[PDB]
């Protein structure tokens, strides 16, 4: 049985920090949320000062990667009411990756609750500048003291706080560009990349290097021997297109198993299927498709999505060392600025939704 | 700017445990440990076995910034004890490190820091037939931030566990394998072939389907045709007559799915140098390995490790599929071979440069 909020210890910090006055991921709040699970179950969860895990040198943490983690944001508005972005499906998310790396089950709205109480105790390092967030990182690590390749009997579950800046520079969408390349790839049919797991990440830290000696910003992550574009960076990715058919259209890969399901490109999907205005589709994208959309003039945009910056333009593409522009900000880009705006809007308050969970 | 074992510090244990066997869970008194950040390697430490404090955005957590290694020092009747090549061990750990952009060291530094500590524990180091001690190496970022980035900094520590004897009787056992082509290790342009801690968490769930099938392992398939990649977390060989006719021992090659066994690498030195067989890397298919069976051409399959040096297989779960492989019924003559001669090496029998003095 899953620890309960309603168990939940408070320990108000004795060491407050001034809030700042801020790269990503590098300045937390006070507290943190902190569940240890062992033979004996889930122990009361805690809220407690920002400290030091404590780890025997054997945990399967950090031998065998028994470690997933969650990220989403929450956002003050001009009432100052703070709310998470679909917080329930960074829940699902998570307890998906738990069960594929073994570790243990947990009640998804005891967890949010939890969270909810995190982050209504530092609520005010939540920033209500434009463009700024509260990152929430939610972690489960295995923690069995034993060298065995195995089901762990201890587990600890946490969750840290980052207040965020804008990330972009007056609001303002600023195009990147990607290295596409064959030879890297992110994951495979069968394989662990649709789930947020640790191990996905670390050695993407030298593809980006190269990267960026190539002269591009972020890695088109492709697939297959037809060369499919899966994510970009962190990010999903989509394409808004007159497609080979004649119809306008929005497409984004499907969830074959090698595409982790973002919660914004959900949204995306969502709020362009309610509009009604063109196709929506998840279908395959291959660079074939891609090269014979650019030639014709039949790109509009080229976007990734992720918590990171909700929508992020494209404008070139680095494939078979021959430079493809990517014609985004010549559209506009019409549809990007469509989503950041409905999406700022949501977030913020200035409409209410159900997305929104208060806190 | 490596870390030098000239500046090692001995900070000796003042609560010593009472030594003993399950496998990787009992810890001698006695860790290595040595820093990372922008002013570069702080001074290596040989300290008592202690817990780790790491702050809670660290990116070993996160993004699995982690690598190990694994190798066996060996106690001969003398009382000498000798690491069994390894320089084979940190040359694997130095291209982990690499390939996660994590700190260079030198390696005859690091190799030298452990044959100190495992001087400091030498009494923790059995020698009992078919014991040893198991030495684990760690490297893994720790920067405190959620940032997906090459690390500014660093901790590689070091742990040891004696160990019992694989096989209590002395005798080898062998295993039977689950290979479903729904499970996947590594794949072609992943890092399979780097001894990552990433590799190894998503199998534990594989592996509970292997039990749950009746099966003890699993036997990794990859491609459509279906290749032998390795077994549990071991690489595997198969002693047959080749479809050419020919004697022979094929271990698949090195080509992107396949970890870079020490033993692995030493079961071939050692049948290259008897000239008695062909000896080659290449892939191996279920389809071969079928038509081989029917036509009674296998004589042993077996996985190759630090573990258990080799292990026998007698049945393979190919799907609904069960086929006896007749490795005990052949013997097994390969297998108690290259188990013989290992021996003979890694217990000071035979004086041998693969082994390293403490
Ligand atoms: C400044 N960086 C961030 O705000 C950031 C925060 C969290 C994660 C983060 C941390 C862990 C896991 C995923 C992450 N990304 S996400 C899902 O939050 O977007 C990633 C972040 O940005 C990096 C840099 C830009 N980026 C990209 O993927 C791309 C930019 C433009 C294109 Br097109 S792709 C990732
Ligand atoms: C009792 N277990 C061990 O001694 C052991 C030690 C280290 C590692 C260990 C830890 C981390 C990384 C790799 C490991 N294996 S290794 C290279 O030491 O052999 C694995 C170990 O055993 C498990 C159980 C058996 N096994 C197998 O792979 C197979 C048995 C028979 C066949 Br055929 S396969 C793995
Ligand atoms: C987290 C993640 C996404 C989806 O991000 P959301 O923030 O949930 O939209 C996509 N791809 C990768 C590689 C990720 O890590
Ligand atoms: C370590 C390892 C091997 C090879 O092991 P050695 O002990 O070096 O012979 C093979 N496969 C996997 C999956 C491993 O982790
Ligand atoms: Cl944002
Ligand atoms: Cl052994």
Redesign the interface.
Same mark, same amino acid.
Do not use: D, E
């Given at each position: 049985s899953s620890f309960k909020a309603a168990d939940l210890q408070l320990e108000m910090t004795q060491k407050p920090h001034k809030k700042p006055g801020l790269?990503?991921?590098?300045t937390?709040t006070d507290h943190?949320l902190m569940v240890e699970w062992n033979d004996k179950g889930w122990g009361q969860p805690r809220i407690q000062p920002?400290?030091?895990?404590?780890?025997?040198?054997? /945990?399967s943490? @950090?031998?065998?990667? @028994?470690?997933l983690?969650e990220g989403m944001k929450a956002f003050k508005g001009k009432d100052q009411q703070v709310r998470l972005f679909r917080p329930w499906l960074n829940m699902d998310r998570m307890l998906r990756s738990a069960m $594929?790396?073994?570790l243990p089950s947990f009640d998804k709205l005891e967890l949010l609750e939890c969270i909810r109480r995190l982050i209504e105790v530092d609520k005010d390092w939540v920033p209500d500048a434009a463009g700024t967030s509260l990152?929430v $990182?939610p972690?489960l690590?295995?923690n069995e003291?034993?060298?065995?390749? /195995?089901?762990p009997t201890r587990a600890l579950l946490?969750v840290?706080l980052?207040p965020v800046g804008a990330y972009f520079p007056g609001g303002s969408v600023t195009p990147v560009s990607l290295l596409a390349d064959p030879?890297?790839?992110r994951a495979?049919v069968?394989?662990?990349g649709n789930y947020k @797991?640790?191990?996905?990440?670390?050695?993407?830290?030298?593809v %980006? %290097?190269e990267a960026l000696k190539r002269g591009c910003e972020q890695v088109l992550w492709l697939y297959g021997p037809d060369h499919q574009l899966t994510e970009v960076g962190?990010m999903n990715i989509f394409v808004y297109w007159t497609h080979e058919d004649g119809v306008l259209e929005l497409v984004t890969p499907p969830l074959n198993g090698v595409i982790l399901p973002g919660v914004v490109r959900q949204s995306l999907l969502d709020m362009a299927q309610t509009w009604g205005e063109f196709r929506v589709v998840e279908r395959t994208i291959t660079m074939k498709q891609l090269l014979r959309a650019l030639e014709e003039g039949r790109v509009r945009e080229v976007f990734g999505s992720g918590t990171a910056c909700q929508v992020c333009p494209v404008h070139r593409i680095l494939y078979k060392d021959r430079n493809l522009h990517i014609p985004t900000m010549e559209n506009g880009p019409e549809l990007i600025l469509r989503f950041q705006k409905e999406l700022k809007e949501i977030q913020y308050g200035i409409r209410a939704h159900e997305w929104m969970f208060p806190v």
């Open positions: 790269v990503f991921g590098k937390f943190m920002f400290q030091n895990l404590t780890l025997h040198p054997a /945990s943490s @950090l031998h065998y990667s @028994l470690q983690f $594929r790396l073994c990152y $990182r972690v690590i295995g003291p034993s060298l065995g390749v /195995s089901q946490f840290i980052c030879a890297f790839i495979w069968g394989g662990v @797991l640790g191990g996905n990440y670390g050695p993407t830290v030298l %980006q %290097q962190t």
